[PDB]
Amino acid sequence: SAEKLFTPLKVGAVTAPNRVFMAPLTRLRSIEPGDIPTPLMGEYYRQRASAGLIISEATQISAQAKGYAGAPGLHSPEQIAAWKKITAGVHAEDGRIAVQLWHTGRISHSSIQPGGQAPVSASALNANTRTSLRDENGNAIRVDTTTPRALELDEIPGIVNDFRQAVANAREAGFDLVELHSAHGYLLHQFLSPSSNQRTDQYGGSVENRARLVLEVVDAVCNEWSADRIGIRVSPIGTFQNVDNGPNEEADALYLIEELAKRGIAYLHMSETDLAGGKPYSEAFRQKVRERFHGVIIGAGAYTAEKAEDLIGKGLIDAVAFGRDYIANPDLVARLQKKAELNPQRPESFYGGGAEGYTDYPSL
Ligand SMILES: Cc1cc2nc3c(=O)[nH]c(=O)nc-3n(C[C@H](O)[C@H](O)[C@H](O)COP(=O)(O)O)c2cc1C
């Protein structure tokens, strides 16, 4: 039965009936051409509608934002129409869903960029990693990332407008909230990190300059819709996709959080460590974050129901986002509430493919 995990929580403009959230999970099953959400994806989300809040897989704000074959977009008419069906299905089950919007930046490949050109980023530095494309049969494959082109100063306003337009589209698509992907080494994080950002204009250098882009985006989207409809995900501590949060990560993190707090947005989603290792957050750091943000705080990263209850009980976080447990358990809320066993995970089908390993996991 637990304690607080199953109690309501006001998240900006909506109210979650429990604090068990579904973390944003890239599954790469969209239709190409078009990067269009599918009926299968609709069923997948609908099966998980009992979550306090569903945060969708990362979705492109524009065609240029694309970095993975199979990832959906929210910039075209066909994409908007498809997502409207998915959010409607979730609402039909009385759930709530937020769309995570991103721009992959340098974690992309020229073959899936508009015109087949090099992807963009803060600086012209290859991420030295791989991304996922699809072969001639539609199967997911890994490929080395393409060296990016540094965005020109005059191109930044366009990036901000793309985020603004995507939120406008999200609103029409029926999403309850939007989550800006400012983590895991993607575009916004590429600007935030001193290791991936070597710009000498006002978007590089000091933390104030490095956080400039993300804050302009936050302001742009709050103005487009409403601050209580805006959430943001950050991974300010540690190293992700070869992007390292500088030698002053903690100080820089608190600066960013205080600035975000000023906009009165719906929530702050903290991805504590990537799938690989990572130093755990100290309660002291959690307290410092807590006192700087006045909205909902979501914790994520190998959480257990026990850890969630502990931190929620200490008043350090308000909700917990589960990723892999949600992939394998559509009715995770019921299972954690009943203290039931969970379905075993099948990692080989996390990315790409079809129904198997997707709408495949049974409910109690
Ligand atoms: C298959 C898969 C896809 C993911 N895709 C996303 C995503 O689209 N956006 C994001 O911010 N994080 C993404 N993550 C990270 C998850 O949201 C989550 O924070 C992470 O899996 C750690 O939580 P867990 O231990 O509960 O799975 C992904 C992770 C996995 C396993």
mmCIF file of C-alpha atoms and ligand atoms in Angstrom:
data_model
loop_
_atom_site.group_PDB
_atom_site.id
_atom_site.type_symbol
_atom_site.label_atom_id
_atom_site.label_comp_id
_atom_site.label_asym_id
_atom_site.label_seq_id
_atom_site.Cartn_x
_atom_site.Cartn_y
_atom_site.Cartn_z
ATOM 1 C CA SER A 1 0.000 0.000 0.000
ATOM 2 C CA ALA A 2 2.988 2.293 0.640
ATOM 3 C CA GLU A 3 2.396 5.800 2.016
ATOM 4 C CA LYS A 4 2.458 8.864 -0.234
ATOM 5 C CA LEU A 5 3.246 7.437 -3.681
ATOM 6 C CA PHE A 6 -0.471 6.933 -4.188
ATOM 7 C CA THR A 7 -1.713 10.366 -3.113
ATOM 8 C CA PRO A 8 -2.749 13.189 -5.483
ATOM 9 C CA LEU A 9 -0.348 15.902 -6.607
ATOM 10 C CA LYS A 10 -1.088 19.196 -8.349
ATOM 11 C CA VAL A 11 1.262 19.528 -11.336
ATOM 12 C CA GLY A 12 0.831 22.958 -12.875
ATOM 13 C CA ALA A 13 -2.500 23.041 -14.724
ATOM 14 C CA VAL A 14 -3.391 19.406 -13.966
ATOM 15 C CA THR A 15 -3.743 17.114 -10.978
ATOM 16 C CA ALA A 16 -2.102 13.694 -10.896
ATOM 17 C CA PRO A 17 -3.952 11.065 -8.793
ATOM 18 C CA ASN A 18 -0.679 9.436 -7.718
ATOM 19 C CA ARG A 19 3.058 10.172 -7.809
ATOM 20 C CA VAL A 20 4.081 7.229 -9.985
ATOM 21 C CA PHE A 21 5.018 8.817 -13.325
ATOM 22 C CA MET A 22 6.054 7.241 -16.627
ATOM 23 C CA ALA A 23 9.458 8.557 -17.694
ATOM 24 C CA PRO A 24 9.975 9.747 -21.287
ATOM 25 C CA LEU A 25 11.077 6.673 -23.258
ATOM 26 C CA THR A 26 12.396 6.679 -26.823
ATOM 27 C CA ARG A 27 11.110 3.491 -28.497
ATOM 28 C CA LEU A 28 11.797 4.336 -32.160
ATOM 29 C CA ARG A 29 8.606 2.815 -33.601
ATOM 30 C CA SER A 30 7.227 5.790 -35.563
ATOM 31 C CA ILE A 31 6.376 5.615 -39.259
ATOM 32 C CA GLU A 32 8.885 6.845 -41.832
ATOM 33 C CA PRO A 33 8.583 8.794 -44.018
ATOM 34 C CA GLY A 34 6.963 11.458 -41.861
ATOM 35 C CA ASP A 35 8.140 10.460 -38.358
ATOM 36 C CA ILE A 36 4.472 9.805 -37.639
ATOM 37 C CA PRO A 37 3.068 8.385 -34.369
ATOM 38 C CA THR A 38 1.157 5.133 -34.921
ATOM 39 C CA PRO A 39 -1.963 3.335 -33.698
ATOM 40 C CA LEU A 40 0.411 0.861 -32.020
ATOM 41 C CA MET A 41 2.051 3.720 -30.116
ATOM 42 C CA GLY A 42 -1.449 4.876 -29.194
ATOM 43 C CA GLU A 43 -2.267 1.475 -27.681
ATOM 44 C CA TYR A 44 1.052 1.434 -25.799
ATOM 45 C CA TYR A 45 0.330 4.777 -24.150
ATOM 46 C CA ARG A 46 -3.286 3.864 -23.470
ATOM 47 C CA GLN A 47 -2.207 0.693 -21.619
ATOM 48 C CA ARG A 48 -0.198 2.947 -19.278
ATOM 49 C CA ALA A 49 -2.853 5.610 -18.707
ATOM 50 C CA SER A 50 -3.152 4.866 -14.963
ATOM 51 C CA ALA A 51 0.208 6.572 -14.398
ATOM 52 C CA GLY A 52 -0.016 9.775 -12.357
ATOM 53 C CA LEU A 53 1.412 11.397 -15.472
ATOM 54 C CA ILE A 54 2.739 9.936 -18.704
ATOM 55 C CA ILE A 55 5.734 11.772 -20.166
ATOM 56 C CA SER A 56 6.049 10.812 -23.834
ATOM 57 C CA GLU A 57 9.114 9.645 -25.725
ATOM 58 C CA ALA A 58 11.309 12.519 -26.943
ATOM 59 C CA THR A 59 9.583 14.210 -29.908
ATOM 60 C CA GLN A 60 11.131 16.494 -32.575
ATOM 61 C CA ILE A 61 10.228 20.192 -32.525
ATOM 62 C CA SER A 62 11.285 20.347 -36.199
ATOM 63 C CA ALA A 63 12.693 18.148 -38.963
ATOM 64 C CA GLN A 64 16.162 19.517 -38.227
ATOM 65 C CA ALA A 65 15.746 18.343 -34.607
ATOM 66 C CA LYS A 66 15.744 14.709 -35.770
ATOM 67 C CA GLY A 67 18.626 12.504 -34.674
ATOM 68 C CA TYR A 68 17.068 9.018 -34.482
ATOM 69 C CA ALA A 69 15.217 7.028 -37.142
ATOM 70 C CA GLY A 70 11.828 6.106 -35.704
ATOM 71 C CA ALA A 71 11.518 9.027 -33.260
ATOM 72 C CA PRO A 72 8.293 11.024 -33.768
ATOM 73 C CA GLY A 73 7.872 14.697 -34.546
ATOM 74 C CA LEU A 74 5.312 17.359 -33.628
ATOM 75 C CA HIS A 75 5.951 19.858 -36.416
ATOM 76 C CA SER A 76 3.861 18.582 -39.339
ATOM 77 C CA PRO A 77 0.080 18.356 -39.946
ATOM 78 C CA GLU A 78 0.156 14.551 -40.146
ATOM 79 C CA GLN A 79 2.127 14.331 -36.897
ATOM 80 C CA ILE A 80 -0.293 16.655 -35.118
ATOM 81 C CA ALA A 81 -3.275 14.607 -36.335
ATOM 82 C CA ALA A 82 -1.654 11.357 -35.166
ATOM 83 C CA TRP A 83 -0.752 12.676 -31.695
ATOM 84 C CA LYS A 84 -4.330 13.981 -31.252
ATOM 85 C CA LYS A 85 -5.512 10.385 -31.453
ATOM 86 C CA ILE A 86 -2.908 9.251 -28.931
ATOM 87 C CA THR A 87 -3.715 11.925 -26.338
ATOM 88 C CA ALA A 88 -7.446 11.296 -26.852
ATOM 89 C CA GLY A 89 -6.906 7.614 -26.114
ATOM 90 C CA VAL A 90 -5.045 8.452 -22.903
ATOM 91 C CA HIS A 91 -7.796 10.846 -21.840
ATOM 92 C CA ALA A 92 -10.441 8.263 -22.683
ATOM 93 C CA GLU A 93 -8.765 6.212 -19.947
ATOM 94 C CA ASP A 94 -8.727 9.264 -17.669
ATOM 95 C CA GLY A 95 -4.968 9.720 -17.831
ATOM 96 C CA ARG A 96 -2.699 12.730 -18.323
ATOM 97 C CA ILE A 97 0.114 12.989 -20.854
ATOM 98 C CA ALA A 98 2.961 15.451 -21.404
ATOM 99 C CA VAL A 99 5.016 15.543 -24.593
ATOM 100 C CA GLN A 100 8.787 15.703 -24.226
ATOM 101 C CA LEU A 101 10.113 18.033 -26.912
ATOM 102 C CA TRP A 102 13.719 17.930 -28.089
ATOM 103 C CA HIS A 103 16.322 18.887 -30.638
ATOM 104 C CA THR A 104 19.053 16.235 -30.788
ATOM 105 C CA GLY A 105 21.736 18.648 -31.928
ATOM 106 C CA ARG A 106 24.988 16.800 -32.614
ATOM 107 C CA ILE A 107 23.554 13.401 -31.600
ATOM 108 C CA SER A 108 22.302 12.895 -35.146
ATOM 109 C CA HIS A 109 23.413 11.792 -38.622
ATOM 110 C CA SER A 110 23.411 13.688 -41.919
ATOM 111 C CA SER A 111 21.394 10.920 -43.621
ATOM 112 C CA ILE A 112 18.296 11.834 -41.598
ATOM 113 C CA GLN A 113 18.814 15.603 -41.601
ATOM 114 C CA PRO A 114 16.956 17.894 -44.024
ATOM 115 C CA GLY A 115 18.849 17.868 -47.322
ATOM 116 C CA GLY A 116 21.220 15.253 -45.938
ATOM 117 C CA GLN A 117 23.376 17.986 -44.421
ATOM 118 C CA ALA A 118 25.385 18.013 -41.190
ATOM 119 C CA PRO A 119 23.411 18.386 -37.918
ATOM 120 C CA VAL A 120 23.734 21.561 -35.846
ATOM 121 C CA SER A 121 25.077 22.241 -32.355
ATOM 122 C CA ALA A 122 26.629 24.898 -30.097
ATOM 123 C CA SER A 123 30.059 24.147 -31.558
ATOM 124 C CA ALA A 124 31.500 22.053 -34.398
ATOM 125 C CA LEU A 125 32.546 19.130 -32.183
ATOM 126 C CA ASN A 126 31.590 15.517 -32.988
ATOM 127 C CA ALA A 127 29.802 13.785 -30.089
ATOM 128 C CA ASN A 128 32.015 10.743 -30.726
ATOM 129 C CA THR A 129 29.164 8.341 -30.050
ATOM 130 C CA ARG A 130 26.479 6.608 -32.079
ATOM 131 C CA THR A 131 22.808 7.140 -32.814
ATOM 132 C CA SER A 132 20.091 4.860 -34.154
ATOM 133 C CA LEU A 133 19.036 4.717 -37.807
ATOM 134 C CA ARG A 134 17.141 2.009 -39.703
ATOM 135 C CA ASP A 135 18.343 -0.366 -42.407
ATOM 136 C CA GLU A 136 16.671 -1.227 -45.704
ATOM 137 C CA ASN A 137 14.297 -3.534 -43.809
ATOM 138 C CA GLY A 138 13.290 -1.023 -41.156
ATOM 139 C CA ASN A 139 15.441 -2.576 -38.446
ATOM 140 C CA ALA A 140 17.210 -0.362 -35.916
ATOM 141 C CA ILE A 141 20.958 -0.023 -36.463
ATOM 142 C CA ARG A 142 23.707 1.968 -34.732
ATOM 143 C CA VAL A 143 25.783 4.508 -36.654
ATOM 144 C CA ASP A 144 28.544 6.956 -35.733
ATOM 145 C CA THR A 145 27.299 10.513 -35.175
ATOM 146 C CA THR A 146 28.049 13.124 -37.858
ATOM 147 C CA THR A 147 30.296 16.080 -36.995
ATOM 148 C CA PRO A 148 27.962 19.060 -36.394
ATOM 149 C CA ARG A 149 27.960 22.584 -37.789
ATOM 150 C CA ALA A 150 28.068 25.366 -35.194
ATOM 151 C CA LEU A 151 24.846 27.384 -35.191
ATOM 152 C CA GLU A 152 25.331 30.936 -36.449
ATOM 153 C CA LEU A 153 24.311 33.655 -33.971
ATOM 154 C CA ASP A 154 21.466 34.678 -36.289
ATOM 155 C CA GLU A 155 20.164 31.106 -36.356
ATOM 156 C CA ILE A 156 19.453 30.983 -32.619
ATOM 157 C CA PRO A 157 16.175 32.937 -32.818
ATOM 158 C CA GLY A 158 14.944 30.278 -35.238
ATOM 159 C CA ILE A 159 15.726 27.508 -32.756
ATOM 160 C CA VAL A 160 13.744 29.340 -30.076
ATOM 161 C CA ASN A 161 10.844 29.836 -32.487
ATOM 162 C CA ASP A 162 10.865 26.122 -33.349
ATOM 163 C CA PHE A 163 10.403 25.256 -29.673
ATOM 164 C CA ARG A 164 7.653 27.898 -29.430
ATOM 165 C CA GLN A 165 5.806 26.510 -32.441
ATOM 166 C CA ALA A 166 6.131 22.922 -31.168
ATOM 167 C CA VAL A 167 4.488 23.897 -27.873
ATOM 168 C CA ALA A 168 1.702 25.608 -29.824
ATOM 169 C CA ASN A 169 1.274 22.347 -31.770
ATOM 170 C CA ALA A 170 1.430 20.320 -28.531
ATOM 171 C CA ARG A 171 -1.414 22.409 -27.131
ATOM 172 C CA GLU A 172 -3.548 21.704 -30.194
ATOM 173 C CA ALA A 173 -2.529 18.046 -30.166
ATOM 174 C CA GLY A 174 -4.251 17.694 -26.796
ATOM 175 C CA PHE A 175 -1.225 17.287 -24.524
ATOM 176 C CA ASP A 176 -1.758 18.315 -20.902
ATOM 177 C CA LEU A 177 1.806 19.541 -20.426
ATOM 178 C CA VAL A 178 5.089 19.862 -22.302
ATOM 179 C CA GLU A 179 8.525 18.803 -21.064
ATOM 180 C CA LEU A 180 11.576 20.533 -22.548
ATOM 181 C CA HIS A 181 14.399 18.023 -23.038
ATOM 182 C CA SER A 182 17.338 19.942 -21.585
ATOM 183 C CA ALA A 183 19.237 16.808 -20.578
ATOM 184 C CA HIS A 184 21.270 13.814 -21.748
ATOM 185 C CA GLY A 185 23.580 15.697 -24.090
ATOM 186 C CA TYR A 186 20.999 16.850 -26.612
ATOM 187 C CA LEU A 187 20.869 20.395 -28.067
ATOM 188 C CA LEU A 188 19.894 22.410 -24.982
ATOM 189 C CA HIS A 189 22.362 20.442 -22.836
ATOM 190 C CA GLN A 190 25.031 20.892 -25.525
ATOM 191 C CA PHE A 191 24.793 24.637 -24.924
ATOM 192 C CA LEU A 192 24.627 24.245 -21.132
ATOM 193 C CA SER A 193 27.824 22.194 -20.924
ATOM 194 C CA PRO A 194 31.255 23.856 -21.140
ATOM 195 C CA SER A 195 32.743 20.695 -22.661
ATOM 196 C CA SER A 196 30.438 20.763 -25.697
ATOM 197 C CA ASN A 197 30.096 24.555 -25.906
ATOM 198 C CA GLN A 198 33.184 26.520 -26.994
ATOM 199 C CA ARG A 199 31.324 29.570 -28.316
ATOM 200 C CA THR A 200 32.740 33.026 -27.699
ATOM 201 C CA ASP A 201 29.514 34.965 -28.259
ATOM 202 C CA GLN A 202 26.801 35.466 -25.636
ATOM 203 C CA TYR A 203 25.757 31.803 -25.799
ATOM 204 C CA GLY A 204 29.056 30.400 -24.575
ATOM 205 C CA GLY A 205 31.549 30.947 -21.776
ATOM 206 C CA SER A 206 29.987 31.919 -18.450
ATOM 207 C CA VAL A 207 27.180 29.822 -16.994
ATOM 208 C CA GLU A 208 24.910 32.823 -17.587
ATOM 209 C CA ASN A 209 25.792 32.609 -21.295
ATOM 210 C CA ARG A 210 25.578 28.813 -21.439
ATOM 211 C CA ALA A 211 22.086 28.832 -19.919
ATOM 212 C CA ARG A 212 20.946 31.699 -22.144
ATOM 213 C CA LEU A 213 19.417 29.537 -24.892
ATOM 214 C CA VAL A 214 17.418 27.239 -22.628
ATOM 215 C CA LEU A 215 16.074 30.224 -20.661
ATOM 216 C CA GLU A 216 15.038 32.019 -23.873
ATOM 217 C CA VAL A 217 13.220 28.815 -24.864
ATOM 218 C CA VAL A 218 11.505 28.592 -21.478
ATOM 219 C CA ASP A 219 10.343 32.212 -21.746
ATOM 220 C CA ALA A 220 9.201 31.696 -25.337
ATOM 221 C CA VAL A 221 7.074 28.657 -24.482
ATOM 222 C CA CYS A 222 5.617 30.160 -21.284
ATOM 223 C CA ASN A 223 4.482 33.117 -23.388
ATOM 224 C CA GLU A 224 3.125 30.862 -26.132
ATOM 225 C CA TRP A 225 1.002 28.773 -23.765
ATOM 226 C CA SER A 226 1.213 29.181 -19.987
ATOM 227 C CA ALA A 227 3.950 28.673 -17.400
ATOM 228 C CA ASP A 228 1.796 26.093 -15.577
ATOM 229 C CA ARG A 229 1.856 23.914 -18.691
ATOM 230 C CA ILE A 230 5.651 23.849 -18.864
ATOM 231 C CA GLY A 231 7.996 21.263 -17.414
ATOM 232 C CA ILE A 232 11.719 20.814 -18.021
ATOM 233 C CA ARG A 233 14.090 17.858 -17.732
ATOM 234 C CA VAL A 234 17.739 18.405 -16.804
ATOM 235 C CA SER A 235 20.648 16.045 -16.018
ATOM 236 C CA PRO A 236 22.962 18.681 -14.400
ATOM 237 C CA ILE A 237 25.170 16.291 -12.427
ATOM 238 C CA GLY A 238 27.490 13.799 -14.111
ATOM 239 C CA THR A 239 28.389 12.908 -17.708
ATOM 240 C CA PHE A 240 25.871 11.983 -20.433
ATOM 241 C CA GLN A 241 26.429 11.177 -24.140
ATOM 242 C CA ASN A 242 29.996 12.415 -23.702
ATOM 243 C CA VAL A 243 28.692 15.822 -22.599
ATOM 244 C CA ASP A 244 30.181 16.601 -19.210
ATOM 245 C CA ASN A 245 28.623 19.075 -16.783
ATOM 246 C CA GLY A 246 31.625 21.295 -16.068
ATOM 247 C CA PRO A 247 33.998 21.467 -13.050
ATOM 248 C CA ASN A 248 31.359 23.582 -11.289
ATOM 249 C CA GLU A 249 28.317 21.442 -12.081
ATOM 250 C CA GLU A 250 26.620 21.871 -8.704
ATOM 251 C CA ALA A 251 26.974 25.660 -8.661
ATOM 252 C CA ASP A 252 25.939 25.928 -12.320
ATOM 253 C CA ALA A 253 22.971 23.633 -11.646
ATOM 254 C CA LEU A 254 21.645 25.785 -8.799
ATOM 255 C CA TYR A 255 22.007 28.900 -10.973
ATOM 256 C CA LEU A 256 19.888 27.288 -13.704
ATOM 257 C CA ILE A 257 17.254 26.125 -11.216
ATOM 258 C CA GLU A 258 16.895 29.581 -9.621
ATOM 259 C CA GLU A 259 16.378 31.100 -13.059
ATOM 260 C CA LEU A 260 13.772 28.480 -13.982
ATOM 261 C CA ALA A 261 12.015 29.126 -10.671
ATOM 262 C CA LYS A 262 11.511 32.753 -11.686
ATOM 263 C CA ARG A 263 9.184 31.684 -14.513
ATOM 264 C CA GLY A 264 6.910 29.724 -12.182
ATOM 265 C CA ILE A 265 6.823 26.678 -14.460
ATOM 266 C CA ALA A 266 4.904 23.491 -13.644
ATOM 267 C CA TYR A 267 7.831 21.228 -12.821
ATOM 268 C CA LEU A 268 11.528 20.412 -12.666
ATOM 269 C CA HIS A 269 12.380 16.871 -13.762
ATOM 270 C CA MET A 270 15.802 15.687 -12.606
ATOM 271 C CA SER A 271 17.489 12.799 -14.405
ATOM 272 C CA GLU A 272 19.987 11.923 -11.686
ATOM 273 C CA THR A 273 22.355 9.626 -13.607
ATOM 274 C CA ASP A 274 22.420 8.128 -17.090
ATOM 275 C CA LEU A 275 21.873 4.386 -17.575
ATOM 276 C CA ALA A 276 25.545 3.821 -16.734
ATOM 277 C CA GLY A 277 26.981 4.624 -13.301
ATOM 278 C CA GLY A 278 26.896 7.991 -11.551
ATOM 279 C CA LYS A 279 27.427 9.627 -8.157
ATOM 280 C CA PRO A 280 24.145 9.753 -6.186
ATOM 281 C CA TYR A 281 22.608 13.065 -5.132
ATOM 282 C CA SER A 282 23.414 14.125 -1.571
ATOM 283 C CA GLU A 283 20.444 15.126 0.568
ATOM 284 C CA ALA A 284 22.237 18.456 0.987
ATOM 285 C CA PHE A 285 22.137 19.034 -2.767
ATOM 286 C CA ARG A 286 18.517 17.875 -2.843
ATOM 287 C CA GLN A 287 17.690 20.445 -0.144
ATOM 288 C CA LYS A 288 19.447 23.200 -2.093
ATOM 289 C CA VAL A 289 17.439 22.340 -5.208
ATOM 290 C CA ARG A 290 14.237 22.025 -3.171
ATOM 291 C CA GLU A 291 14.504 25.554 -1.741
ATOM 292 C CA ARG A 292 15.159 27.096 -5.164
ATOM 293 C CA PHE A 293 12.197 25.708 -7.103
ATOM 294 C CA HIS A 294 8.550 26.356 -6.167
ATOM 295 C CA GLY A 295 6.887 23.825 -8.429
ATOM 296 C CA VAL A 296 6.747 20.048 -8.555
ATOM 297 C CA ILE A 297 10.085 18.195 -8.495
ATOM 298 C CA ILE A 298 10.316 14.793 -10.194
ATOM 299 C CA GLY A 299 13.177 12.421 -9.434
ATOM 300 C CA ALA A 300 14.379 9.780 -11.921
ATOM 301 C CA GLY A 301 17.136 7.225 -12.392
ATOM 302 C CA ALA A 302 17.022 3.651 -11.099
ATOM 303 C CA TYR A 303 14.448 4.537 -8.451
ATOM 304 C CA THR A 304 12.671 1.927 -6.345
ATOM 305 C CA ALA A 305 9.278 2.505 -4.754
ATOM 306 C CA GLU A 306 11.100 2.519 -1.392
ATOM 307 C CA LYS A 307 13.524 5.237 -2.484
ATOM 308 C CA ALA A 308 10.631 7.313 -3.831
ATOM 309 C CA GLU A 309 8.678 7.022 -0.571
ATOM 310 C CA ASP A 310 11.791 7.918 1.409
ATOM 311 C CA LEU A 311 12.571 11.078 -0.574
ATOM 312 C CA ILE A 312 8.945 12.122 -0.938
ATOM 313 C CA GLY A 313 8.530 11.609 2.810
ATOM 314 C CA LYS A 314 11.519 13.847 3.476
ATOM 315 C CA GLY A 315 9.885 16.505 1.320
ATOM 316 C CA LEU A 316 12.803 16.524 -1.130
ATOM 317 C CA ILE A 317 10.870 15.500 -4.269
ATOM 318 C CA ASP A 318 7.153 15.291 -5.123
ATOM 319 C CA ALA A 319 7.010 12.483 -7.664
ATOM 320 C CA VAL A 320 9.129 9.771 -9.249
ATOM 321 C CA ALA A 321 9.431 8.892 -12.935
ATOM 322 C CA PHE A 322 10.026 5.208 -13.697
ATOM 323 C CA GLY A 323 11.425 4.283 -17.084
ATOM 324 C CA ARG A 324 12.250 0.621 -17.609
ATOM 325 C CA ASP A 325 9.690 -0.590 -15.064
ATOM 326 C CA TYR A 326 7.048 1.210 -17.120
ATOM 327 C CA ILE A 327 8.266 -0.365 -20.347
ATOM 328 C CA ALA A 328 7.614 -3.783 -18.813
ATOM 329 C CA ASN A 329 4.597 -3.010 -16.603
ATOM 330 C CA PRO A 330 1.683 -1.062 -18.079
ATOM 331 C CA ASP A 331 -0.122 -1.225 -14.728
ATOM 332 C CA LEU A 332 2.931 -0.315 -12.648
ATOM 333 C CA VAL A 333 0.755 1.792 -10.327
ATOM 334 C CA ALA A 334 -1.433 -1.200 -9.452
ATOM 335 C CA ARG A 335 1.586 -3.480 -9.028
ATOM 336 C CA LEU A 336 3.449 -1.120 -6.695
ATOM 337 C CA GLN A 337 0.249 -0.458 -4.778
ATOM 338 C CA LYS A 338 -0.479 -4.181 -4.410
ATOM 339 C CA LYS A 339 3.207 -5.017 -3.899
ATOM 340 C CA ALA A 340 2.864 -7.466 -6.799
ATOM 341 C CA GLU A 341 5.741 -8.875 -8.819
ATOM 342 C CA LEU A 342 6.758 -7.108 -12.007
ATOM 343 C CA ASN A 343 7.070 -8.562 -15.509
ATOM 344 C CA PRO A 344 10.695 -9.241 -16.481
ATOM 345 C CA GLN A 345 12.307 -6.718 -18.842
ATOM 346 C CA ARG A 346 13.354 -7.549 -22.411
ATOM 347 C CA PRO A 347 15.988 -4.874 -23.285
ATOM 348 C CA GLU A 348 16.567 -6.235 -26.799
ATOM 349 C CA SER A 349 13.203 -4.788 -27.857
ATOM 350 C CA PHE A 350 13.447 -1.381 -26.156
ATOM 351 C CA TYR A 351 14.467 0.284 -29.431
ATOM 352 C CA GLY A 352 12.787 -0.305 -32.778
ATOM 353 C CA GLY A 353 10.685 -3.237 -33.872
ATOM 354 C CA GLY A 354 6.953 -3.696 -33.475
ATOM 355 C CA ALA A 355 4.379 -4.946 -30.983
ATOM 356 C CA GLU A 356 6.727 -7.525 -29.459
ATOM 357 C CA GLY A 357 8.401 -6.049 -26.383
ATOM 358 C CA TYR A 358 6.104 -3.020 -26.674
ATOM 359 C CA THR A 359 2.358 -3.674 -26.133
ATOM 360 C CA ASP A 360 3.494 -7.172 -25.151
ATOM 361 C CA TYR A 361 3.766 -6.866 -21.372
ATOM 362 C CA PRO A 362 0.576 -8.002 -19.597
ATOM 363 C CA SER A 363 -1.291 -6.253 -16.813
ATOM 364 C CA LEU A 364 -2.322 -8.017 -13.609
HETATM 365 C C1 LIG B 1 14.779 2.562 -23.861
HETATM 366 C C2 LIG B 1 14.954 3.931 -23.180
HETATM 367 C C3 LIG B 1 14.645 5.110 -23.797
HETATM 368 C C4 LIG B 1 14.801 6.414 -23.164
HETATM 369 N N1 LIG B 1 14.377 7.546 -23.811
HETATM 370 C C5 LIG B 1 14.326 8.686 -23.128
HETATM 371 C C6 LIG B 1 13.687 9.882 -23.699
HETATM 372 O O1 LIG B 1 13.096 9.881 -24.784
HETATM 373 N N2 LIG B 1 13.940 11.049 -23.050
HETATM 374 C C7 LIG B 1 14.628 11.162 -21.793
HETATM 375 O O2 LIG B 1 14.705 12.378 -21.230
HETATM 376 N N3 LIG B 1 15.188 10.041 -21.248
HETATM 377 C C8 LIG B 1 15.014 8.856 -21.820
HETATM 378 N N4 LIG B 1 15.459 7.708 -21.197
HETATM 379 C C9 LIG B 1 15.764 7.811 -19.745
HETATM 380 C C10 LIG B 1 14.519 7.479 -18.918
HETATM 381 O O3 LIG B 1 13.547 8.521 -18.952
HETATM 382 C C11 LIG B 1 14.888 7.215 -17.434
HETATM 383 O O4 LIG B 1 15.281 8.471 -16.792
HETATM 384 C C12 LIG B 1 15.933 6.138 -17.221
HETATM 385 O O5 LIG B 1 15.538 4.926 -17.907
HETATM 386 C C13 LIG B 1 16.279 5.800 -15.787
HETATM 387 O O6 LIG B 1 15.104 5.369 -15.083
HETATM 388 P P1 LIG B 1 14.762 3.841 -14.837
HETATM 389 O O7 LIG B 1 15.866 3.245 -14.000
HETATM 390 O O8 LIG B 1 13.441 3.921 -14.007
HETATM 391 O O9 LIG B 1 14.567 3.149 -16.146
HETATM 392 C C14 LIG B 1 15.408 6.428 -21.840
HETATM 393 C C15 LIG B 1 15.856 5.209 -21.283
HETATM 394 C C16 LIG B 1 15.570 3.965 -21.839
HETATM 395 C C17 LIG B 1 15.861 2.693 -21.071
#
